[PDB]
Structures are given as structure tokens and as C-alpha cells.
A and B are shown apart, each in its own frame.
With several copies, the nearest count.
Chain A
Amino acid sequence: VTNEKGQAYTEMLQLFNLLQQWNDFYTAENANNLLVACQQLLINYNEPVIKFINDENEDKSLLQYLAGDDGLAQWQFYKGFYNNYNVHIF
């Protein structure tokens, strides 16, 4: 049980650091938005997010793990997510 809580904290920090590369952190509001966006990704899309975190490929996309290879599905997911959290997940 102790390992599982430690792993969840590591997964959240890893996802946050990856998404931070595509998100401006100048404002405190955006920093809060990315934190909320990461916790909603881990709660609703755990298996996709864990695959994305553990992928060592330079061209890896979280959208591919979340919506598959269909660009229109990826776009519709991204647009819905960005409207809700103001966070980039490319």
C-alpha cells in the first residue's frame, strides 16, 4: 500500500513536468490549471497517461494514448480539454 501512494505521487509529478513543457507558467492561475488538468487526466485516463509517462520515444503524444490515431478525435478531445482546463496536452 505504501508503494502505491508513492507511485501515484511520482506519476503526478512526471505528468506535471511533461505537460509543463507545452504550458506557460508565468501566471499562478495557469499553474493551478495544469495541476487540475493532470489530476483529471490520471483519474479519468490512468492507463493512457501511465503509457505516455513510461514512453521513451521523443515524438510521443498524450493525445494518441487518449484518442487513438484519428486526428479528428484527437482534435475534438484536445479542444474539449483545452476549453475546460486551459491546458495544452500535445
Chain B
Amino acid sequence: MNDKEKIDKFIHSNLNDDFGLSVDDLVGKVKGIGRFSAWCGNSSTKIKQVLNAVKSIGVSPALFAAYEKNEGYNGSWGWLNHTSPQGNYLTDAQFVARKLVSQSRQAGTPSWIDAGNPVDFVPASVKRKGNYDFSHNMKNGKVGRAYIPLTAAATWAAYYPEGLQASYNRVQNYGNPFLDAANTILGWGGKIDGGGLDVVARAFEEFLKKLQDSMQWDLHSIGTDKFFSNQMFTITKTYNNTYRLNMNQKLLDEMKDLISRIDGGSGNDTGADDSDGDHGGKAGKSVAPNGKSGRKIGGNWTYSNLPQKYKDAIEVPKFDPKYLAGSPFVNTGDTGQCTELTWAYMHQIWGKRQPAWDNQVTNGQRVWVVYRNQGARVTHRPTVGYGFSSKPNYLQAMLPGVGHTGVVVAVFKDGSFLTANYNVPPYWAPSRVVEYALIDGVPENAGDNIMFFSGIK
């Protein structure tokens, strides 16, 4: 890299560019250098404090250290030359770092004339090119934006390096701030140059391994030569020399559940009658699971922005926050959780304090178990006034092992239903904002993936 290429890449580097040098790399190199020696007493600890402070404000420790090395030490001046010291070493370093960050973003023009010795010698053609580069090519937050406006020496170093010589400027020989800083950083070893998809692949490989694991278990004889099945696969004789390999329904469920739900797949848990048994229940309307797994077909509306047709369809009283008061979830740090809404809203609908726990972790997927253990019925039918428990993929459940819960507030002739929810986007816990979501019916074989429970009576 020639000196012009070094200056060009260096002024176009970000003000916060590490230049391939860590704070630990610089601490040994800046011992004996100006204010690091005079103010920090060559203390590795004090030097690290200054370099970390300038880094946190958005200034490169390597750039700040290279500047101090080239500029030299004047006792009467702060870390920025021609400034008084501001408080102690650290306070002054933080002040200078904030000034450089502000200047870099600041509206500015290259300082073509030295304020102290005003001689206009730079060709108007050079000034036009440097002004164009500084205004159009040099983005905010670059090293050049921080230094080129501050001094004529910096402006000449960037766009007219010959102007640093007394021959051209007619005053004195000036140092090259950009080349000297660049050479110092390079001398120190610094360099100037100017998504879970794999997880998807690993998941597939695991499934292939899971296929091997299913096969590990030995087959049994089903009847005679006709069949030889276990609990995952069926070997069925087809002809004298033929056997076709079928697969046991469990196997399909065994891994199909794994596809959507990581654990607890479907337990073939005790369920409720297909009949709504509205008489059997306290009241409300229900719809049969209709297949079409689907998911949320609309939702997360607050009561104010809920579409009127869905607002008219709500068959339960609007949630009253007074039921939340005295909530057991406040003490546990679970304020605004979907389980807290389920507890408070079911208390409002059923007129009795509902259960929050059964001496086990209660979460969206399992809250139906807590209610069932207290005599709360439960069904695979979305029923108005009933709580729901959903493992991930269903009714807005996003986290495996946590699931989601809420209350069914309306059911529709097409078998879709409206749910009231807490802790869903955009209002996460502990917001306690009630959000209404339209759900696309229920899969016939959801099982414990989706459970609808009543309130205790």
C-alpha cells in the first residue's frame, strides 16, 4: 500500500474501527507515550480504563492511542491538542472521544486554510475535488469526518499532501496526521483496509437417526406368515416370495408429533363426548374439531381495534381487570403471563377463584391438567367460556415445553373460534393487555396438543 492509499483507506475507516487491535494489545504499546505516561503513570489498569472509555463512546482505542503518540505531550493541554484538560485523565479522554464522535457526525467542510497562519495556496481544482469527496463519498462517523474540518494540516494530508511542506504553504512544515497515525497502527500490528439454516439440516439428520431408532426395536409375529408387526412397523406377506412393509399408526404419531411438538406428542388422554352436552355444561356454544390444523387466522386485536363482526360474536363478559387484583402470579414474577389471564378471566366467567398450580410448573401447554385435577371437565371442542391449553404450533403456542393458554370467547359456524390472550405479540408480559385472536378450527387428531378446559364450579 502506497502512502496515498494508506491515507485514503484510513480517513474512510469508521471512527470506531478497532484496526485489528484490542485494548489489551494497545496497553503495553502505549506505555511511555505522552499522557499515558504523564497522567496514567504507565499503569496498565488506568490505560485500560481510558482505552475502554473511548471505545464505549464510539472512538477506536487504536486511533486515539495513535493520535496521542504522534501529537506528543504538552502538560498544559488535554488529550486533544490545543484544549485545556477537562477534569482527570479519564474524564478528559471521555470528553475528547465525545467531541470526535460529534464532529464526525457534524455538518462540516474541509479546513483549506490554517486559522493561525492564513495562506490560500491550494489549487481551486483540488479544493473542489476534496469538498466533493468530503460531502458525497465520506459518510458520517468516518475518521476523516472527525479530523478534516478541525485543521488545515488534516485537510492537506487528505487531499493535497504537498501542502504540508513550507514550500507550498509558505509558513512551516506540518506533520501528516493520517499517514503518521496509519503507520503507528500498522507498526503496532493494526491493519487498515477501509442464520440457523444449518440447525434445520441437523434437525433433518436427527429425524433420519430417529428413523434408525424406531427400527432398533425387534418385530413380533402378528398371527402367522401373513403378518410380522411390532408397535412401529408391519411386515405383511404379499405372496409366496413377497412381503410388503407397512408402518404401525403409533410410528406415524411417534415422529409426526415430533415434527410439530418436541415432547408429550399425543397421550391419547381421557377426553369428552363429541356431543356438546350444553346441558351437561354450565352454558355457551361449542364446535367439533373439523381437521384443517391451520392456526391463528387473524388476531392480537385489543378490544378497541377488534373488527365489529368478531366483537358482536363475543358471548362472554368483557374481561374486568378487578379479577386480576390479588393474582398469585404477581408474587412469582409471572405478571401478565397467559396463565394469569386464564386464571382471572375463568374466575370472572365461572364466579369462583380458579386454580393456578398443582405443586408442579404450570404453563400454557399444561394448565388444563391443573384445572382437570380440580374437577374442570376439559374437551377437544372449542367451547365459549372455556380455557384452552396449546402445545407449540397451536393457538399461538411458540415455545416447546411452555405452550400457550387463554379463553375461548366466540365460536363460528365455519368451526373457527375467537380467543382472549395475554403475553402474545405485540403486548408481551407483563403488559396485561387482552388480545383477541381468530383460530382456524381444531385438527381431529390434535389430542393433548390442544385441550379445552372449563372453570371449576
Contact = CB atoms under 8 A, between A and B. Distances in A.
- Touch between A and B in complex, CB under 8 Å? yes
Nearest to B404: A84
A84 B102 contact: no
B199 A75 contact: yes
A40 to B, nearest CB: 8
Lowest 4 A-B CB distances belong to which pairs?
A6-B333, A71-B202, A84-B398, A72-B206
A64 to B, nearest CB: 11
A29 B56 contact: yes
Contacts of A83: 398
A58 B203 contact: no
Interface of B: 56-58, 78, 83-86, 98-99, 102, 105-107, 140, 195-196, 199-200, 202-207, 210, 258, 262, 331-335, 392, 397-402, 425, 428-430
B366 to A, nearest CB: 13
B107 A16 contact: yes
A74 B99 contact: no
11 contacts: A3-B331, A20-B107, A29-B57, A32-B56, A43-B333, A71-B199, A71-B206, A72-B202, A73-B400, A77-B401, A78-B199
Given A70-B206, A73-B206, 8 more contacts: A3-B331, A17-B106, A21-B98, A36-B428, A58-B84, A63-B199, A71-B202, A80-B399
Interface string A25-67: 1110100100010001001100000000000011100010001
Contacts of B262: 67, 72-73, 76-77
B202 A75 contact: yes
A9 B203 contact: no
A81 B398 contact: yes
B296 to A, nearest CB: 11
A6 B334 contact: yes
Query: Chain A contact residues: over half helix, strand or loop, or mixed?
Result: helix
Contact of B400 (A7, A80, A90): A80
Nearest to A31: B107
B57 A72 contact: no
Given A58-B84, A78-B196, A90-B196, A71 B400 contact: no
Given A9-B333, A29-B56, A76-B262, A82 B196 contact: yes
Please tell me the size bucket of the interface on A.
Answer: 35 or more
Contact of B207 (A22, A59, A72, A79): A72
Given A3-B331, A21-B99, A80 B196 contact: no
B295 to A, nearest CB: 11
B7 to A, nearest CB: 25
B392 A80 contact: yes
Given A20-B106, A58-B83, A6 B400 contact: no
B86 A10 contact: no
B210 A72 contact: yes
Given A29-B57, A80-B400, A90-B199, A21 B102 contact: yes
A18 to B, nearest CB: 9
A17 B258 CA distance: 33
Given A58-B83, A76-B262, A6 B332 contact: yes
B335 A74 contact: no
A23 B12 CA distance: 24
A28 to B, nearest CB: 9
Contacts of A7: 333
Given A25-B105, A80-B399, A90-B196, A71 B205 contact: yes
A46 B95 CA distance: 27
A3 B332 contact: yes
A44 B402 contact: yes
Contacts of B195: 88
Nearest to B83: A58
A71 B400 CA distance: 14
Nearest to B207: A72
Nearest to A42: B333
B400 A76 contact: yes
Contacts of B204: 72
Given A9-B333, A80-B399, A20 B199 contact: no
Nearest to A2: B332
Give the most central of A59, A72, A77: most B CB within 10 Å: A72
Give the most central of B335, B402, B428: most A CB within 10 Å: B428
A27 B335 CA distance: 27
